[PDB]
Amino acid sequence: LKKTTGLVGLAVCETPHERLKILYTKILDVLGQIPKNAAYRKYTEQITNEKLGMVKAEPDVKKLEEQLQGGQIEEVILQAENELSLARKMLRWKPWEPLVEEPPANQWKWPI
Amino acid sequence: GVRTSPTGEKVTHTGQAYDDGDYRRVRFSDRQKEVNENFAIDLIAEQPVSEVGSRVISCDGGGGALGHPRVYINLDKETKTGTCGYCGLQFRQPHH
Amino acid sequence: LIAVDEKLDITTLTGVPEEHIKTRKVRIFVPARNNMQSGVNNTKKWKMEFDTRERWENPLMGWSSTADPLSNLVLTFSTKEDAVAFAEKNGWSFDVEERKVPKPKSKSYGANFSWNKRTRVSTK
Amino acid sequence: TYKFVNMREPSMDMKSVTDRAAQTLLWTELVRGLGMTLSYLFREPATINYPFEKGPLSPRFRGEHALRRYPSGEERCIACKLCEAVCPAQAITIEAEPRADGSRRTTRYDIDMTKCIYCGFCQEACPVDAIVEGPNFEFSTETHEELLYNKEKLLNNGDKWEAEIAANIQADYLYR
Amino acid sequence: TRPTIRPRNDVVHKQLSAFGQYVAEILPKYVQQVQVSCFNELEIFIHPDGVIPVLTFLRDHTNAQFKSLADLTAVDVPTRQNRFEIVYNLLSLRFNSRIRVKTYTDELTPIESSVTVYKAANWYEREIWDMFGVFFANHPDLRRILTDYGFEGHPFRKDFPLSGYVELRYDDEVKRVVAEPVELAQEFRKFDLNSPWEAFPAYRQPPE
Amino acid sequence: ASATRVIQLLRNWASGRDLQAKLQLRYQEISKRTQPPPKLPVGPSHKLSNNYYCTRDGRREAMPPSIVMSSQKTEKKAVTPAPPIKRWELSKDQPYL
Amino acid sequence: TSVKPIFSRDMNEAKRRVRELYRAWYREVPNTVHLFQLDISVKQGRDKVREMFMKNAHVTDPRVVDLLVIKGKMELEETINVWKQRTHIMRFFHETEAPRPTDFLSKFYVGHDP
Amino acid sequence: NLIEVFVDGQSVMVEPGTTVLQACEKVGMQIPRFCYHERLSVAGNCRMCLVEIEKAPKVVAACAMPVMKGWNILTNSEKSKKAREGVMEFLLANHPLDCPICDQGGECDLQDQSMMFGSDRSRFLEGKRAVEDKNIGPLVKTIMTRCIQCTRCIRFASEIAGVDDLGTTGRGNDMQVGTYIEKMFMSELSGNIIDICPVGALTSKPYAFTARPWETRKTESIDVMDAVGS
Numbered sequence A: 001l002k003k004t005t006g007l008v009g010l011a012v013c014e015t016p017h018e019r020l021k022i023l024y025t026k027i028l029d030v031l032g033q034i035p036k037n038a039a040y041r042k043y044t045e046q047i048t049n050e051k052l053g054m055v056k057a058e059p060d061v062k063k064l065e066e067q068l069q070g071g072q073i074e075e076v077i078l079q080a081e082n083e084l085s086l087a088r089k090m091l092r093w094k095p096w097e098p099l100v101e102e103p104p105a106n107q108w109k110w111p112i
Numbered sequence B: 001g002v003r004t005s006p007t008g009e010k011v012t013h014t015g016q017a018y019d020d021g022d023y024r025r026v027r028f029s030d031r032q033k034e035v036n037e038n039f040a041i042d043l044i045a046e047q048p049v050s051e052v053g054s055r056v057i058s059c060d061g062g063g064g065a066l067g068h069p070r071v072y073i074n075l076d077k078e079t080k081t082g083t084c085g086y087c088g089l090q091f092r093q094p095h096h
Numbered sequence C: 001l002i003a004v005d006e007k008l009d010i011t012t013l014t015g016v017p018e019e020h021i022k023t024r025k026v027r028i029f030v031p032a033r034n035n036m037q038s039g040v041n042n043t044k045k046w047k048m049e050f051d052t053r054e055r056w057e058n059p060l061m062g063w064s065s066t067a068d069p070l071s072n073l074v075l076t077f078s079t080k081e082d083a084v085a086f087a088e089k090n091g092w093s094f095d096v097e098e099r100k101v102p103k104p105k106s107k108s109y110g111a112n113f114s115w116n117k118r119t120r121v122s123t124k
Numbered sequence D: 001t002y003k004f005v006n007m008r009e010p011s012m013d014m015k016s017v018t019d020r021a022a023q024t025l026l027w028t029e030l031v032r033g034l035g036m037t038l039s040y041l042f043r044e045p046a047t048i049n050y051p052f053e054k055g056p057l058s059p060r061f062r063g064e065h066a067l068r069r070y071p072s073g074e075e076r077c078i079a080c081k082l083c084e085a086v087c088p089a090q091a092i093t094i095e096a097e098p099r100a101d102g103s104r105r106t107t108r109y110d111i112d113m114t115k116c117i118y119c120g121f122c123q124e125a126c127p128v129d130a131i132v133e134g135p136n137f138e139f140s141t142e143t144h145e146e147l148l149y150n151k152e153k154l155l156n157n158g159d160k161w162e163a164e165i166a167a168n169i170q171a172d173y174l175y176r
Numbered sequence E: 001t002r003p004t005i006r007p008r009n010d011v012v013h014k015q016l017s018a019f020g021q022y023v024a025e026i027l028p029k030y031v032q033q034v035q036v037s038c039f040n041e042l043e044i045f046i047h048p049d050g051v052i053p054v055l056t057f058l059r060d061h062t063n064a065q066f067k068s069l070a071d072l073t074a075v076d077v078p079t080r081q082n083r084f085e086i087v088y089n090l091l092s093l094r095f096n097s098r099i100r101v102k103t104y105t106d107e108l109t110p111i112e113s114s115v116t117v118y119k120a121a122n123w124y125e126r127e128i129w130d131m132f133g134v135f136f137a138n139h140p141d142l143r144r145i146l147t148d149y150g151f152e153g154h155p156f157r158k159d160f161p162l163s164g165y166v167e168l169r170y171d172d173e174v175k176r177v178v179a180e181p182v183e184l185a186q187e188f189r190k191f192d193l194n195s196p197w198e199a200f201p202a203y204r205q206p207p208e
Numbered sequence F: 001a002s003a004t005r006v007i008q009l010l011r012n013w014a015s016g017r018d019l020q021a022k023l024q025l026r027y028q029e030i031s032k033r034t035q036p037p038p039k040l041p042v043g044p045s046h047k048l049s050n051n052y053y054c055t056r057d058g059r060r061e062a063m064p065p066s067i068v069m070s071s072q073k074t075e076k077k078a079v080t081p082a083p084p085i086k087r088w089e090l091s092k093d094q095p096y097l
Numbered sequence G: 001t002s003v004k005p006i007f008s009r010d011m012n013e014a015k016r017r018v019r020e021l022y023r024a025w026y027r028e029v030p031n032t033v034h035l036f037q038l039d040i041s042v043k044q045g046r047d048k049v050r051e052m053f054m055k056n057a058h059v060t061d062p063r064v065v066d067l068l069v070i071k072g073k074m075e076l077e078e079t080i081n082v083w084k085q086r087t088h089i090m091r092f093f094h095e096t097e098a099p100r101p102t103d104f105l106s107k108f109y110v111g112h113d114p
Numbered sequence H: 001n002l003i004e005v006f007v008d009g010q011s012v013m014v015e016p017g018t019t020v021l022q023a024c025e026k027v028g029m030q031i032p033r034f035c036y037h038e039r040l041s042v043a044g045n046c047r048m049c050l051v052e053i054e055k056a057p058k059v060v061a062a063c064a065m066p067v068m069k070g071w072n073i074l075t076n077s078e079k080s081k082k083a084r085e086g087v088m089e090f091l092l093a094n095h096p097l098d099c100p101i102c103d104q105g106g107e108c109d110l111q112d113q114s115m116m117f118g119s120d121r122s123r124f125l126e127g128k129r130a131v132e133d134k135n136i137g138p139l140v141k142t143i144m145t146r147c148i149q150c151t152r153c154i155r156f157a158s159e160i161a162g163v164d165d166l167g168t169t170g171r172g173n174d175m176q177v178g179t180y181i182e183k184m185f186m187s188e189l190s191g192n193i194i195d196i197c198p199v200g201a202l203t204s205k206p207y208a209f210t211a212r213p214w215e216t217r218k219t220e221s222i223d224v225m226d227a228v229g230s
């Protein structure tokens, strides 16, 4: 509907709602493979279901942008893609495990 | 008060003068040696002594905020004059 | 993760000349308190400094010349062990001076007025 | 708030299209630039006739250095080495001893003018207004050594520029 | 009013503390410590091999969009076993915030190159290598950036002399610039400025 | 400036502006190079009483950073570094160039 | 104590990388002499490469060897890309420094150096 | 047996008869001082070391007050800070403006403790006191306008050097330190009064005006003039 997003290289999407729903569903699908007690899984599932609920309840793009407070709808789509990629990488990394190694006895001391 | 060394070289107010056998005098050949003719010690000796009827006087060097930090000189020793050592100024109590 | 049964030595990596690696003896020590002041806040960390080299007089302007790169180099360490480890891994010789702390002293203001002892003062 | 530097579209009416086509075929903006340059040609130049005319300066200007004296002729410097301590580039070398009359006076006061950054810190830290930065700036030399001032050279600078230095310090001393 | 004392921002302090707890909970495997300085700056200390996961999380996470790499440098502390301290400064434009991530390394331990997270890391890590000697594993082009060609040693190290070991001049015999050992007409006069009286009791360390 | 009337007309016509209104050369419109002496204010800490440095010491109020989490040592809502930055408003003064 | 290897695992692979870098430098000296118009011989350049390799022959840490070969590759690619000038290439040879004395009597005569 | 005292709430076991200053020294806190020297007797006159005990309405001289069981020493409390500021205010009210022409310069306890524990401004709108200078030999130069009447030189002279020719003459603000007669304090231990004097009243005469503390490089060696090996 709008001519440009105002940002160089960011094209306008004619179907924001469907793309956002697809991306959020894929993110939720990836998070199901993460352990239930993982702190990463709970927070991003919470925020994704919060944002997925907003897109399923507001059909107007301008009001959806106002409600999401994430910039423009194309920026929201790009952020959803980044979150999906991060979820996949964290699934590969598994950073919910206990600390790899405590530092030496005096490593963050200051002044020294 | 400039003074001349035995080699004909002017002596500065710090007493500096190259020795006769010193090779470093070659830098002045076909040129000159920078010596300031005014001697602060001689000028401040030329300055007189101020007589004030007080045991303690104050000196700020003249000019107020344009001088030196204000100091107090105790004029009790009658065998000498009290000298403000910021500006080398002598003060004395009236004798006789 | 490889296992190396070798001592740490980075002399070939630091880029220091061989002369200033081999012929240098650093001094690991805690600086003595400046006798002109009663503060002791400069006697808390260990210091590493090099041996004094020659200083001569500039023919022009009479300034103090030097040919020693490490004349002004002083390093600060929190521990004698840390300083020794740094010196060992950098390959310089080192001389270690044990820290000197003042011994505890028994003070009493009432000793200035002793009835039979020499601690009685003649003035206040 | 924000504004768009370039987000306007041109009107596609026939008159505006013809105007743009006339601008393209008849180089209107190029003629406009020519007119601007012609106007500047017929304006008066902003060039001063140096060395017979000098650019304006202020009492705060930091130029060549000078060692000052008291009105009695005594040197103001008391060998306190505050300027040497505060010098960023370490351009000042000072050596002192008691004088014949016991005064605390310097024997060596060197400033390397090829090392100095002319930052004015030495005259700020001086408690007796001894070291100052004079108004002189035309003191270029032909050899490097001539820019390595010593105490005699600085005292000669002070004696040479004392009147102007005193006037500038009088003008600007209430802001310090 | 206290006109000469900097005012504090408890709101921003609490927000930064909450977000530090958030990231520490999300990444327990790497995050070692979280601090908030009293002038409202969040600082995260992580394990050296968590650099890529932590930076990728802080860049791509929806609740942490630190899309900009403000700076990347290192600090040399010879008294530590791991003398080099790598510092990343990130800026989040979406939430108008800044964060700092600190890791540690020594001479012989590489640090993963973050050119796949931020493209500025290329030149920032080149400078870190050139000035401290820290090697970055997967770097597209790792070489000197600021020092002269063939320069030996890493000058920002605390043990490197201020004037270095060599100096340059033009030699007329060989018709080229030559490098010779450094020799100063005036030696840099070292000053001892520290006062022997403690200034800040709040930072006093235990005698141990 | 000192110029002929015809030359001023030519300059104004060529540039399209009245140049005499905005001249780039200074003609006695600048401040005098000699000024009366000033008297600068003192400050807020120049009191003679109820002015102790311990109550106005900024450096001594600095503290080591608070250790929020240290490894050595309900459903929480997800948090952000700060509230999301609000959308900027278009300029009322001149929205477009 | 197990440590993260930069490369080469044990010492054999570090020696292999040293040999690879030595071959790369050995095959480059004629090109360096040709491009930089050096007045030295190709044999002189190869001898200098050998000498610079031999002063690190006492290293027994594979990670130090890996860092040394990394820096050798860096200074080789500076020579190949002609980023260096004849100035640096001849800085390798110390053609202008006076020969420092090495015996006790001469060192005693000249100055106070150890 | 050791008694338990508290410095800023931190427990520390100290021997009976230990002072507040020594307890703070044990916990690593150096209380400011001008007259206290650990090698000399306790004078307690400069009043710079006043600290607050937790329940005591009155500040105590930390250099002369033995600690009691269960004493909490508030070293950085408001009362202690105000006491230090007041004492420094009196000291600098009567002190002269001689810092640039003074050899003590950057190694002065008055300057450092004024920068660390005193105020940054002066309320003294009167004239200052100027004191005649004495002559006690060719080694120690005396500018007694800078003296703060801390009696470190007197105590050192008497107790350490066994020479009782230093003391205070007069009383009040006109109290002066000297011999009261033209006598040279000649002894083999005369420079230590130069060392222990916190101000520039006693300075080295051969070293006068030659250098400043920040310039000098310190080389830690031993002494060869005798067989003590100082």
Ligand code: SF4
Pocket (backbone or CB within 6 Å): D083, D086, D087, D088, D089, D090, D091, D092, D111, D115, D116, D117, D118, D119, D120, D121, D122, D123
């Ligand atoms: S102007 Fe600055 S750099 Fe120059 S001598 Fe003064 S303090 Fe030093």
Ligand code: SF4
Pocket (backbone or CB within 6 Å): D076, D077, D078, D079, D080, D081, D082, D083, D084, D094, D122, D125, D126, D127, D128, D129, D130, D131, H100
């Ligand atoms: S600051 Fe002034 S009085 Fe002090 S040494 Fe420098 S020129 Fe001399």
Ligand code: SF4
Pocket (backbone or CB within 6 Å): H095, H096, H097, H098, H099, H102, H103, H104, H105, H106, H108, H109, H110, H111, H146, H198, H199, H200, H201
């Ligand atoms: S004794 Fe200390 S405070 Fe007094 S003039 Fe000397 S340096 Fe300044």
Ligand code: SF4
Pocket (backbone or CB within 6 Å): H146, H147, H148, H149, H150, H151, H152, H153, H154, H177, H196, H197, H198, H199, H201, H202
């Ligand atoms: S001369 Fe010095 S040591 Fe003696 S009482 Fe005065 S300040 Fe103390």
Ligand code: FES
Pocket (backbone or CB within 6 Å): H032, H033, H034, H035, H036, H043, H044, H045, H046, H047, H048, H049, H050, H061, H062, H063, H064
């Ligand atoms: S140090 Fe205690 S009163 Fe002087």
Ligand SMILES: [Mg+2]
Pocket (backbone or CB within 6 Å): H104, H193, H194, H195, H196, H197, H198, H199, H200, H201, H202, H203
């Ligand atoms: Mg003294």
Ligand SMILES: [Zn+2]
Pocket (backbone or CB within 6 Å): B059, B060, B061, B068, B084, B085, B086, B087, B088, B089
């Ligand atoms: Zn005076």
